[PDB]
Structure 1
Amino acid sequence: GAAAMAQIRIHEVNTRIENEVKVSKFLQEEGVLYEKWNISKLPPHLNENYSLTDENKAEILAVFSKEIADVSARRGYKAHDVISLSNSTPNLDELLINFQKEHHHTDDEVRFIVSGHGIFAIEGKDGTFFDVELEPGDLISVPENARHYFTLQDDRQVVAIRIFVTTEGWVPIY
């Protein structure tokens, strides 16, 4: 929907934080890095574009290269790429069930949304799960050892840049 930035839904009580400042203050308290990058830079032929060429991908990484350098140097990341998921993706179901289950990782999990939507569900330090619902222009870093899972929204499609330390730190520890 129409949200500009990320919003939070707390799990048991169902309450919502939507104000910009409170959202980022809240994520700060949970160790979740949040940044808003200037998505208006993205060329329009790359907006809501889900069948991505090798060229389209390289271009996407070219446009946010500065923002990537800054976050990769501030936080110690090394490599990056682009993935897209949609209803048309073969094995969608059999892929998603890997990130729909609660897992953690031994490195941070960093994603920047370019198109579509996602929801990260993160176990807060007080034991309660909260959602971060992401809009394009949203970069989130989910800290090492934090139990979480991932879900698409009802449009079942997302395009993202993944930033990682090593390929080997991507594994779900269930």
Structure 2
Amino acid sequence: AAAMAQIRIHEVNTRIENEVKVSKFLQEEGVLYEKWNISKLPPHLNENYSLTDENKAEILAVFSKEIADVSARRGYKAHDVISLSNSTPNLDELLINFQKEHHHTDDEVRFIVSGHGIFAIEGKDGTFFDVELEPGDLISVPENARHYFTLQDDRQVVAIRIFVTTEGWVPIY
């Protein structure tokens, strides 16, 4: 009963928390889930949303190999880092775009560096489920999966946006 990356299935309000049951579940639905060594992260970068460019390029350096592997697996090109939190003067106005149910023509892959997030993703059967993400969680939302995204009750995330193509973060509503 230690939980990482829990699922809340929507219409039947059910939670899968045991971590083998979750990774298997996400496997059935076409979604990659990996856990990386978030403990390979320095303390200064632990929960730092006032991120500078020397910071972002180090977060990237720490996880270069994991990125490499995931980029190789899905044949992706680039990566960056974004921090969302109160004290982003435009949080609401950004988030609103991706809370609207959408899909992309590429996988959307994200690794949670600090804070939390939730991807609500349309299952194969037809039912949505929430994928509640903590620091250390890597997630790929497959191309054409219908989803939306949301911050948790903490209202702050820092993620590594990894990219198949430039044109694939674009929401198709």
| TM-score normalised per structure 2 | 0.98
Q: Could you tell me whether the CA contact under 8 Å between 1:34 and 1:138 is conserved in 2?
A: yes
How far 1:168 moved relative to its partner? Answer: 1.1
SS state at 2:99 partner:
coil
Question: Hey, what does 2:90 align to over in structure 1?
Answer: 91
Deviation at 1:3, TM superposition (A): 6.1
1:19 aligns with 2:18: yes
TM-aligned CA deviation for residue 4 of structure 1? 4.6
Contact 2:74–2:164 (8 Å) recurs in 1: no
Superposition deviation, residue 40 in structure 1: 0.4
Give the whole-Å Cα distance in 2 for the aligned partners of 1:99 and 1:108: 15
Secondary structure of 2:44's counterpart equals helix
Give 1:169 shift: 1.2
Structure 2 gaps of 5+ residues are none
Shift of 1:94: 1.2
- Which whole-Å CA distance do the structure 1 matches of 2:114 and 2:141 have between them? 19
Would the aligned equivalents of 1:4 and 1:135 in 2 still touch at CA under 8 Å?
no
The equivalent of 1:139 in structure 2 is: 138
Q: Name segments (4+ residues, structure 1) moved above 6 Å.
A: none
Instruction: Determine the C-alpha separation between the residues in 2 that align with 1:4 and 1:17.
Output: 9
SS at match of 2:154: coil
Does the 8 Å CA contact 2:82/2:161 hold for their aligned counterparts?
yes
Q: Percent identity?
A: 100
Alpha carbons 1:3, 1:135 under 8 Å: kept: no
C-alpha deviations, 1:24-80, integer Å up to 9, x for none?
000000000010001100000000000001000000000000111111111111100
CA–CA distance in structure 2, aligned partners of residues 108 and 67 of structure 1: 17
Q: CA RMSD in A?
A: 1.2
TM-score of the superposed pair, with normalisation by structure 1: 0.97
How big is the shift at 1:101? 0.3
